[PDB]
């Protein structure tokens, strides 16, 4: 995800993943900060992982609005 | 052998699961466990070669401070340790039992926390204990003698918050001579945040009697 | 309040059909809501099948209820209660019953806010406890855990505990169960911390009786209830047998220290001797008391 | 007098000599046998963080009075609440990991067989069978 | 050779510290065996072995620690061919029959190690 | 965002001292004050973790040259583009005359970087967009400026331009 | 070494009498079966539990549900439900 | 034995017949070498019954017996007590190698 | 700030679970003996109920035992009243002899030989209790691994010899019911299932404790179909 | 063994040691403190100190410290040894090497109690150290005296501003 950048240490790149550059990567991604994603690092998976990240009934007055939403419930209080 | 991008898909915390995790013969089925209610998690000094306790932090560990309440008992002094005894039965019973009934331990730990390698409770223990003393609105002598504040002055951020206005986390707070009367600016204090029976009650609390 | 497989709906009355006025969803864990009870309209308690028991907070304004606290234990809940507002009783398949508050600390923080402050918002949550969310995102997800405070075991599968107020104008108010296989049984609060301590010594007395009368036969063989369970009648100590699956917290056995009633005074007068304390007549006093004066 | 010892216990199974952390064990393994169903359990769960980092120890007089810690201590928490830690490194990837926990599953199955049949951490996806009995409600 | 020729000293030189050596001698050349016993040559160890149990000069005390090496390579290996096996047996056999039952033991303690390792169809 | 610098610290001072010092200003999570641990002797700063960054903000703003320690003042303060190689450039040819003439391609981020190899001069032009960097290699490339011949291609890391580099690329654009 | 190789020993005569005691390599096929064949000797074990599982299955006798919950412990039991 | 590594217990169904210690081995519990607090009599095995070997202490099996063996209370708590017959077979190496030494 | 409970058993449990027909106490009556009287039992409790007048009275109810009571059956030895002879959880065999001692009924224990571990688990020797019709020998199962038999005797104190055991290693155990039989050699029977089969074959399957060699035989084993449910002894055929 | 000192425990709170590294933990057991290494006995430990390991953790610890720490000029007359012990040692062994000057903060001491000023610390082999406070910030800190000639000696002030007249043993320094 790195510019495919190279590194030399296993601790290193384990340190890569809290970083101001490999955090631009993925927020300028699109794919937010932090630590559920600190493991994998090729661009595509964490748009997957990225993806899997991320209904009231208000009785109107004629008793057929048991169906009718709060919203469009308010709407009609507006409306009436 | 899934990737563990695959592998954390299926998670309902996928920030537990590692690098290594996806190498298990059955990760399916670790990482179902791993992620289930309540497990903890394996202590982390595995694939360390240090043997789980090497000096660093041992180095500098302190010898033993008896209890509080064993200290009194005043041993320290009739059997210098570092670096005949004339006691007396009753006050030692009294001790464990009466005055020593509910005495517990100040931190203890609680039920996930294992104890890695360089963590150190004497850090930890004094930090609770420091929060609950240290307060907004009150300075200690000593340092109000760092600060040079006398008791009675107010301290110098005071006409910064007269511009800007109060603490932002404590809405509470009054501040002798700002939303406080300024008499109140007393001795060590400037400010001050000013806003059952459990079905089990005993109602009686009696200890076992030696005699 | 109506609880789906996962999640809680509240309903109140229309005309033409009843309609949704609210709706939670739940944490990860609960898949089943088995059973669930209230505190005067400010808390619920959440059984599951599997996972043990939460508490929440109606909060007025979110119009949701809000997870305070959570159980260490998996624990299969058959029917559970409040026996007060803070603390909960509960059952299991399979036979234990347990009794569940909720930590001091976190009963601070619910006495000095405003529930809307949980979900979102400023508590200001100590140091340890934020560490415990990062450390053990699944363990500690609530974020406290109820401290177990009785459990016991009773073979019986329990269906309904009642809390009564008083028994026959009892003081101690107790809490009476029933189980399936067909069973009253109460669990009466000891006021005193000494009294306990005299029951305490009458359970431990009787508890291992079958191995006193077996050492003290040895014994007398040595120098001059044959069997190792003679007082028993089967092997099996006490408090393997009531802890089973996990060990009993406070509840003293008040159906062991009444077989106590039933021995020869020779027996009464051979175990009392290991106490200090009061005689054989004042034992039975003892024991007999409950019945009387505490139902 | 428990309360009193675990901060005795806590420097000795902290301490970095692997004979402290033989002979503080050997206090537990007494200690919780017969506290055990008193209601310590606070000091049992503290007594216990600090055991189980011990699990992956060498030296076969300190590992057995481990593990007579670790089995005494079963019964001073209950099986459900010392699972807890042991479930997941049963498994594992690490084949050493994974070897040194079935020693402690395997002492707490023989004491526990029945007793732990409501603690299994299975769930119907988690396990191919499951048994659909477990989800019905009366 | 001039390498492996020093494995050929280094057994004879364990076996040696094993049968006559000091206390402290023989216990650190018995934890060597018992951990190397496998990487040396089980022909090696056995033919090397072997032999002295058969002279008329060896004490007791020293017999029994040439027999106590036995049991406890036996114990390891786990695959054995069947010219040692005759040759165990000429060894082992006739404590059966010695006169008191400490030694009847240790020599009843090597056949039922070895009639598991030299599996049933070989004896 | 929650967390502020303390400087200006004398080592005497304690984490307990700026910790009662601190929660005076706003709730303090957590104080991390590094230490050397062959003198055990504090470094003279500090990180003060708040709950949030409006606490963070109000304490920076409070307390910032406001308060004497040992009669120190304290301090308290807050706490992948396109580029092309271009080789055998004219003398005449000034800095900012190559903004001129890659502006009409494309935004620079930053500005060119004129250097000599061998002599042979060469600069870096930096580019905000991986397409508008083709489209002034494609119009530039091997093109007489100044009665010069420029060459113009990607800078090395080997060069840029891969595949994976217009995709991160246009990412970092949106 | 002497004292690891007892431990093998006991481990061969603890898994004869107590039946499921995982080693180290342990399919997780192995291992669910151990699982499942607890939890079905304790679910007709206890009076209570089986009574709890007869009713809410609406079997028509308690000793139905006893055998239902013992022949389970075969594999084939799920096959033979299935050929009815 | 708890400290002495060699030895193999027996661990066959118990029977109905009760084990033997030596007044050497006398007052200890066969699992944990425990000389306090006894709980039950242990029950050995008929294949460890029988002729002479019935008489020798259940431990070291080689002094003939004379009380019974008990199994302490901490060993019947968790359970060590219904394995199976504990019965030392061999003599193992620390007895053996007494001997030979002294002649 | 705890909460310390005191547990009573009000009612006791009645879903009663075991039973067993014999003469156990000789009661109100110098000299009377008639087989009808018969002792009931639920996991935990046990009663005692007297029959001849017609009708079902309760004769004693007994101390609260605390345990599991996995199996009851009366053993009527020759040459004597009948004790009956229960396993329970705790893995003993525990022979009761029901006594009038003081005043009242007590149950009073005569034998617990021990069998493997405390808890209701899948391998232990219990559940299943069936006892020749003679007295000569009681035999226990398990569900799995192992089934013993225990050989009863009676003299100036009852005795039992040591067990008998079999051990067939992954078969459940389904019906074990009892052949009665004159003397000959006890013989039982059972239903198994094999718990590692590719397919369902649950198999009947005959067992003669021999006498003379003193060890139990497997006699005949036939193979029935998936659906086989239970067993029961019929008598003699002459 | 120990030739009679006192080691002292690790927790004592610091009589200069003998060396200074080693100590005793909690425990009885000895341990340098640089190494991390457990010793048995002073017969280990006199094998440790002269190890190659202790050996080179002083030298990383000594570059670890060797990465950190028309007027009026003062002039400091040094005198050694009239030839009363230097007859014992003749063996070319730096004994063309000259006294060296170092200016040293007194940020380090072994005691480490007060501090803030400089020191122009004097050396010679056998001879002692010598320091001199420097409370001034500046004097006699010249500009480009001679004509930048590069025999860096040791450092731009030794060579800039020393003389060691060898024949008399008087080194000269301003």
């Given amino acids: 995800i790195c510019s495919n950048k190279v590194y030399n240490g296993r601790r290193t790149f384990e340190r890569h993943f809290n970083e101001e550059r490999h955090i631009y990567h993925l927020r300028c991604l699109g794919i937010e900060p932090s630590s559920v994603f600190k493991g994998i690092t090729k661009i595509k998976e964490a748009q997957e992982l990225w993806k899997n990240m991320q209904e009231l009934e208000l009785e109107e007055e004629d008793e057929e609005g048991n169906v009718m939403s709060k919203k469009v419930y308010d709407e009609l209080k507006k409306q009436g | 052998k899934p990737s563990l991008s695959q592998l954390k898909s299926q998670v309902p915390y996928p920030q537990i699961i590692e690098w290594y995790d996806c190498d298990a013969r059955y990760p399916g089925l670790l990482a179902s466990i791993k992620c289930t209610k309540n497990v903890i998690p394996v202590p982390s000094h595995w694939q360390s070669k240090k043997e789980y306790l090497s000096g660093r932090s041992l180095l500098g560990k302190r010898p033993f401070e008896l209890p509080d309440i064993i200290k009194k008992t005043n041993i320290e002094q009739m059997r210098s340790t570092l670096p005949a005894l004339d006691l007396d039965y009753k006050k030692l019973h009294d001790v464990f039992f009466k005055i020593g009934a509910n005495w517990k331990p100040d931190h203890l730990l609680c039920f996930g926390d294992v104890y890695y390698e360089n963590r150190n409770l004497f850090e930890e223990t004094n930090w609770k204990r420091m929060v609950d003393h240290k307060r907004p609105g009150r300075i200690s002598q000593e340092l109000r003698a760092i600060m040079n504040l006398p008791e009675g002055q107010l301290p110098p951020w005071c006409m910064k918050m007269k511009d800007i206005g109060l603490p932002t986390g404590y809405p509470d707070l009054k501040i002798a001579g700002l939303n406080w009367d300024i008499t109140n600016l007393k001795g060590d204090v400037y400010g001050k945040i000013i806003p059952r029976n459990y079905f089990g009650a005993l109602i009686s609390f009696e200890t076992p009697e030696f005699e | ?256 220290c009444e077989n106590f009633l039933r021995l020869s005074l020779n027996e009464q007068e051979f175990l009392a001797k290991n106490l200090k304390s009061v005689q054989v007549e004042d034992i039975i006093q003892t024991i007999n008391e409950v019945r009387t004066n505490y139902m | 007098y428990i309360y009193f010892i675990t901060p005795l216990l806590e420097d000795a199974l902290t301490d970095r000599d692997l004979v402290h952390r033989q002979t503080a064990s050997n206090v537990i393994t007494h200690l919780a046998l017969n506290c055990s169903g008193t209601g310590h359990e ?97 | 050779l001039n390498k492996d020729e020093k494995k050929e000293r280094t057994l004879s030189m364990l076996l040696l510290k094993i049968k006559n050596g000091n206390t402290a001698s023989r216990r650190t050349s018995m934890r060597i065996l018992t951990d190397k016993a496998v990487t040396f040559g089980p022909e090696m160890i056995f033919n090397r072995l072997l032999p002295i149990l058969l002279d008329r000069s060896l004490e007791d005390q020293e017999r029994h620690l040439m027999i106590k090496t036995i049991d406890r390579v036996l114990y390891q290996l786990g695959d054995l061919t069947k010219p040692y096996v005759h040759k165990i047996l000429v060894v082992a056999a006739p404590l059966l029959i010695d006169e008191d039952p400490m030694v009847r033991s240790t020599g009843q303690e090597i056949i039922t190690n070895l009639s598991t390792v030299a599996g049933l169809k070989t004896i | ?160 331009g891969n595949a994976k580099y217009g995709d991160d690329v246009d990412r970092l654009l949106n | 070494m002497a004292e690891k190789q007892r431990q093998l020993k006991l481990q061969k005569i603890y898994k004869q009498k107590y039946i499921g005691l995982g080693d180290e390599s342990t399919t997780r096929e192995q291992w669910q079966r151990n699982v499942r064949n607890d939890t079905l000797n304790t679910l007709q074990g206890h009076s209570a539990s089986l009574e709890y599982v007869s009713l809410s299955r609406g079997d028509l006798s308690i000793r139905d549900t006893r055998i239902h919950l013992l022949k389970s412990m075969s594999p084939g039991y799920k096959a033979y439900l299935r050929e009815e | 034995s708890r400290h002495q590594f060699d030895l193999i217990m027996c661990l066959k169904q118990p029977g109905v017949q009760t084990g033997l210690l030596c007044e050497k081995c006398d007052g200890k519990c066969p699992i944990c070498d425990s000389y306090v607090r006894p709980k039950r009599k242990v029950r050995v095995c008929e294949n460890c019954s029988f002729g002479k070997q019935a008489k020798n202490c259940i431990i070291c099996n080689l002094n003939v017996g004379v009380n019974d063996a008990f199994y302490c209370w901490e060993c019947c708590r968790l359970g060590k007590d219904k394995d199976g017959c504990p019965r030392i077979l061999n003599l193992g190496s620390n007895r053996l190698d007494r001997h030979f030494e002294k002649k | 700030d705890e909460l310390y409970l005191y547990h009573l058993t009000l009612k006791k449990q009645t879903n009663f679970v075991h039973s067993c027909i014999g003469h156990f106490v000789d009661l109100e009556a110098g000299s009377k003996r008639e087989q009808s009287q018969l002792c009931v039992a639920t996991e935990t409790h046990l009663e005692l109920y007297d029959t001849a007048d017609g009708e079902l009275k309760l004769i004693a109810k007994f101390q609260n035992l605390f345990a599991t009571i996995t199996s009851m059956k009366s053993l009527d030895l020759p040459h004597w009243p009948t004790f009956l002879a229960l396993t329970s959880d705790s893995g003993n065999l525990s022979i009761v002899q029901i006594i009038m001692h003081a005043g009242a009924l007590r149950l009073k224990t005569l034998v617990n030989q021990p069998l493997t571990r405390t808890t209701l688990r899948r391998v232990s020797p219990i559940s299943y209790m069936e006892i020749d019709p003679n007295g000569r020998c009681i035999i226990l199962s398990s569900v799995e691994q192992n089934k013993l038999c225990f050989l009863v005797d009676y003299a100036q104190k009852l005795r039992i010899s040591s067990p008998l055991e079999i051990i067939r290693p992954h078969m459940v155990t389904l019906d074990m019911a009892v052949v009665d039989v004159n003397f000959n050699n006890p013989c039982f029977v059972t239903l198994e299932i094999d718990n590692a089969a590719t397919q369902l074959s649950v198999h009947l399957i005959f067992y003669v404790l021999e006498l003379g060699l003193n060890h139990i035989v497997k006699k005949a084993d036939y193979l029935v179909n998936p659906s086989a449910n239970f067993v029961l002894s019929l008598p003699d055929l002459s | 063994l120990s030739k009679g000192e006192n080691v002292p425990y690790t927790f004592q709170d610091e009589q200069v040691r003998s060396n200074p590294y080693i100590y005793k933990n909690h425990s009885g057991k000895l341990v340098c403190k640089l190494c991390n290494t457990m010793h048995m006995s002073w017969s280990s430990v006199e094998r440790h100190l002269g190890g190659k390991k202790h050996g080179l953790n002083v030298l990383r610890r000594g570059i670890s410290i060797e990465k950190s720490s028309g007027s009026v000029g003062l002039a400091i007359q040094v005198n050694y040894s009239s030839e009363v012990k230097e007859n014992s040692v003749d063996s070319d062994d730096k004994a063309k090497v000259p006294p060296l000057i170092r200016i040293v903060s007194g940020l380090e001491l072994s005691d480490t109690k007060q501090k803030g000023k400089k020191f122009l610390v004097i050396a010679y082999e056998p001879f002692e150290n010598i320091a001199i406070e420097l409370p001034p910030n500046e004097i006699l800190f010249s500009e480009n005296n001679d004509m930048d000639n590069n025999n860096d000696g040791v450092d731009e002030l030794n060579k800039k501003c020393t003389f060691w007249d060898a024949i008399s043993k008087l080194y000269y320094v301003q």
Wanted: hydrophobic content about 40%.
């Fill in chain 3, 1 to 256: 309040l109506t609880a789906m497989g996962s999640t809680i709906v509240l309903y109140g009355l229309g005309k033409k059909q009843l309609l949704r006025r609210s709706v939670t969803q739940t944490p990860v864990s609960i898949t089943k809501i088995v059973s669930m009870h209230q505190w005067n309209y400010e808390r619920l308690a959440v059984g599951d099948i599997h996972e043990s028991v939460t508490l929440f907070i109606w909060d007025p304004a979110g119009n949701v209820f809000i997870p305070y606290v959570d159980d260490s234990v998996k624990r299969h809940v058959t029917v559970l209660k409040f026996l007060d507002e803070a603390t909960v009783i509960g059952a299991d398949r399979y036979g234990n019953a347990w009794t569940l508050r909720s930590p001091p600390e976190c009963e601070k923080i619910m006495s000095n806010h405003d529930p809307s402050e949980l979900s979102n918002g400023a508590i200001k949550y100590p140091l340890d406890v934020i560490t415990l969310q990062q450390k053990l995102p699944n363990t500690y997800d609530c974020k406290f855990k109820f401290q177990l405070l009785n459990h016991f075991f009773v073979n019986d599968i329990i269906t309904d505990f009642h809390i009564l107020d008083s028994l026959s104008n009892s003081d101690r108010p107790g809490c009476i169960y029933m189980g399936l296989q067909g069973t009253v049984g109460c669990f009466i609060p000891l006021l005193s911390k000494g009294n306990v301590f005299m029951m305490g010594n009458i359970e431990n007395i009787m508890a291992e009786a079958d191995d006193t009368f077996y050492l003290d036969y040895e014994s007398r063989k040595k120098n001059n209830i044959i069997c190792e369970g003679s007082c028993s009648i089967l092997g099996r100590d006490h408090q393997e047998y009531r802890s089973y699956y996990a060990p009993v917290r406070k509840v003293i056995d008040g159906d062991l």
């Fill in chain 4, 42 to 138: 606070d000091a049992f769960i503290h007594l216990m963080n600090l055991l189980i980092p011990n699990i992956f120890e060498t030296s076969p007089h300190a590992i057995m009075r481990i593990l007579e810690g670790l089995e005494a201590l079963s019964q001073a928490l209950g099986p459900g609440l010392f699972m807890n830690y042991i479930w997941a490194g049963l498994f594992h990837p690490a084949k050493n990991v994974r070897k040194a926990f079935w020693r402690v599953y395997n002492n707490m199955y023989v004491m526990y067989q029945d007793a732990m049949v409501p603690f299994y951490p299975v769930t119907p996806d988690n396990n191919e069978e499951y048994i659909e009995e477990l989800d019905l409600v009366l």
């Fill in chain 6, 1 to 160: 965002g929650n967390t502020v610098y303390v400087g200006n610290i004398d080592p005497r001072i304690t984490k307990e001292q700026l910790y009662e010092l601190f929660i005076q200003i706003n709730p303090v999570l957590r104080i991390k004050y590094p230490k050397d641990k062959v003198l055990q002797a504090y470094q003279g700063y500090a990180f003060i973790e708040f709950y949030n960054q409006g606490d963070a903000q109000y304490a920076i703003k409070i307390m910032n040259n406001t308060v004497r320690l040992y009669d120190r003042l304290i301090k308290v303060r807050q706490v992948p583009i396109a580029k092309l190689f271009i080789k055998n450039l004219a003398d005449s040819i000034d800095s900012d005359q190559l903004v001129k003439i890659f502006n009409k391609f494309g935004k620079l981020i930053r500005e060119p970087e004129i250097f000599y190899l061998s002599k042979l001069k060469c600069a870096y032009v930096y580019f905000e967009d991986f397409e508008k960097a083709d489209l002034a290699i494609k119009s530039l490339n091997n093109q007489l400026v100044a009665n010069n011949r420029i060459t113009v291609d990607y800078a090395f890391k080997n060069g840029k």
